[PDB]
Amino acid sequence: PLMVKVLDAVRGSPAINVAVHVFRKAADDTWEPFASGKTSESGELHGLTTEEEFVEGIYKVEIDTKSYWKALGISPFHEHAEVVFTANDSGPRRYTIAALLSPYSYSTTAVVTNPK
Amino acid sequence: PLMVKVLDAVRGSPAINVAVHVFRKAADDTWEPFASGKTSESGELHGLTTEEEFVEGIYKVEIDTKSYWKALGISPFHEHAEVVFTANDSGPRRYTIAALLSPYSYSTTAVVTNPKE
Amino acid sequence: PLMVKVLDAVRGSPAINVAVHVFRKAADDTWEPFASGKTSESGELHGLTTEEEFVEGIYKVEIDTKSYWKALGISPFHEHAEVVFTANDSGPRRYTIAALLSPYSYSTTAVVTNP
Amino acid sequence: PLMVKVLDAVRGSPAINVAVHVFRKAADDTWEPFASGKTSESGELHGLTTEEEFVEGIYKVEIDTKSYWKALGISPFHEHAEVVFTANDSGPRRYTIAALLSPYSYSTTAVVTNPKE
Numbered sequence: 136p137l138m139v140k141v142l143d144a145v146r147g148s149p150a151i152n153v154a155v156h157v158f159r160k161a162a163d164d165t166w167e168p169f170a171s172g173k174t175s176e177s178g179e180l181h182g183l184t185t186e187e188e189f190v191e192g193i194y195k196v197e198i199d200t201k202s203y204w205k206a207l208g209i210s211p212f213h214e215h216a217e218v219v220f221t222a223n224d225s226g227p228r229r230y231t232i233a234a235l236l237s238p239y240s241y242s243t244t245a246v247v248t249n250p251k
Numbered sequence: 252p253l254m255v256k257v258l259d260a261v262r263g264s265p266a267i268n269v270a271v272h273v274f275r276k277a278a279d280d281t282w283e284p285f286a287s288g289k290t291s292e293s294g295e296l297h298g299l300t301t302e303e304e305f306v307e308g309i310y311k312v313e314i315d316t317k318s319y320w321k322a323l324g325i326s327p328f329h330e331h332a333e334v335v336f337t338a339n340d341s342g343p344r345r346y347t348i349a350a351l352l353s354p355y356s357y358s359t360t361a362v363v364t365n366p367k368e
Numbered sequence: 369p370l371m372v373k374v375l376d377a378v379r380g381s382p383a384i385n386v387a388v389h390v391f392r393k394a395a396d397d398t399w400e401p402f403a404s405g406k407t408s409e410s411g412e413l414h415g416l417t418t419e420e421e422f423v424e425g426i427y428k429v430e431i432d433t434k435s436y437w438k439a440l441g442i443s444p445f446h447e448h449a450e451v452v453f454t455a456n457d458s459g460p461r462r463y464t465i466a467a468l469l470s471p472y473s474y475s476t477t478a479v480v481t482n483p
Numbered sequence: 484p485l486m487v488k489v490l491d492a493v494r495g496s497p498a499i500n501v502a503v504h505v506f507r508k509a510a511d512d513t514w515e516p517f518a519s520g521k522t523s524e525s526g527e528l529h530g531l532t533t534e535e536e537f538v539e540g541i542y543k544v545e546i547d548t549k550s551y552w553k554a555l556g557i558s559p560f561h562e563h564a565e566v567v568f569t570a571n572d573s574g575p576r577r578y579t580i581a582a583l584l585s586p587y588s589y590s591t592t593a594v595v596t597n598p599k600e
């Protein structure tokens with residue numbers, strides 16, 4: 136139901152071991168921790184939640200791009216990359232958040248699909 | 252010293268009248284308002300601050316992409332686009348933050364130049 | 369060994385049924401057809417070639433973006449999206465060419481891995 | 484009428500001194516040279532053509548990304564970045580082709596404007 140994929144545009148490789156922290160916005164307007172993990176050898180992060188755990192709300196996906204670059208000896212521009220979105224419609228959809236990284240640029244896309 | 256440029260990848264045009272809110276991170280770890288404005292006819296936002304007002308710190312540039320799309324009758328994916336970065340940490344630089352928008356995707360880049368060259 | 373993935377940045381979906389034509393540059397500096405296909409329900413195109421068919425050379429991956437947009441009633445800017453690169457020059461690699469599409473913009477990335 | 488802007492996503496800078504070659508497609512389906520230049524200190528290339536010279540047709544803008552990276556000691560993926568498009572098909576327009584570069588990735592976008600406003 137929720138997948139994150141991260142790619143490295145400088146090395147032409149998946150971005151491996153990247154820390155990802157997901158939050159859900161709570162009634163008090165604060166961000167509550169929801170799920171977290173590290174990207175795999177293929178730059179993917181799977182099994183963050185279940186269909187029933189992943190309910191309607193505003194989510195924040197935070198990707199620790201600064202530590203990723205610093206660990207390669209590169210000094211990047213951004214503190215991190217954040218993605219905030221309504222999984223308004225979330226349980227009956229699958230969400231893939233993709234991010235492509237460079238030291239001074241990033242881009243992000245969402246692929247949202249229905250299991251019919 | 253701080254310029255924002257926004258482009259619309261669907262219409263192939265500058266993204267006009269887009270709300271931009273800048274914050275500075277305060278000692279207490281909360282975001283304090285710093286400057287705000289709307290993109291011009293060319294998708295640019297100038298004169299947000301001065302060299303002297305624009306001090307060392309962590310800034311957040313928040314672009315109200317959701318309203319932009321909604322006003323064109325499109326239901327977008329993201330609540331906004333945010334750019335967080337450390338500025339002026341090795342002396343005064345001019346920053347341009349560029350953003351390219353689509354309903355389900357965005358990309359952002361920084362061009363940092365030294366006024367001493 | 370060679371995969372193409374295409375995404376639609378407007379609808380937030382894989383770009384389905386997109387025509388992809390691959391060429392290899394021949395000695396006479398003309399583009400010789402090499403493989404071709406349509407993107408699947410997942411926006412992917414697999415099994416285009418084999419490790420031994422896919423030899424050292426300069427390849428061109430051509431994505432028919434114009435027809436994709438026109439079929440959705442949108443009049444796009446580019447005739448197509450082309451990706452030209454040298455492959456297998458330093459021994460066999462697996463290549464994924466990804467493309468993200470909008471009417472007036474596209475971006476492309478390569479993921480190259482060693483088995 | 485035709486402007487090219489190139490940015491370096493690794494250094495957060497304009498991409499300077501980048502070779503750009505523009506072609507027009509001829510009746511025999513071959514690419515005829517049309518204009519060429521190097522990006523300036525701001526990553527821009529101006530004055531490639533005139534309104535009168537810049538006629539209806541299919542153009543190719545070719546950016547020599549491989550030599551750019553190689554001159555910075557980096558071994559890139561692409562031979563170049565090409566943009567192919569139909570211009571002035573419904574009368575005169577002003578075209579800006581923008582490109583953002585990384586060793587293994589690039590993105591390109593067009594801003595097309597009408598001087599008739």
Ligand SMILES: O=C(/C=C/c1ccc(O)cc1)c1ccccc1
Pocket residue numbers: 264265292293579594595596597
């Ligand atoms: O090329 C431009 C195109 C501008 C434009 C403005 C409005 C519009 O609807 C379409 C294009 C331009 C003009 C001034 C500064 C920067 C860029």
Ligand SMILES: O=C(/C=C/c1ccc(O)cc1)c1ccccc1
Pocket residue numbers: 140231233234235242243244373375466467468475476477
């Ligand atoms: O967002 C992307 C997503 C790529 C992707 C790759 C594999 C996959 O399973 C899902 C998404 C992307 C692709 C090309 C250029 C810039 C960004």
Ligand SMILES: O=C(/C=C/c1ccc(O)cc1)c1ccccc1
Pocket residue numbers: 256258347348349362364488497524525526581
């Ligand atoms: O903001 C941009 C570049 C700004 C800039 C500022 C200073 C400098 O020296 C070079 C480029 C830009 C312009 C056209 C399309 C997309 C982005």
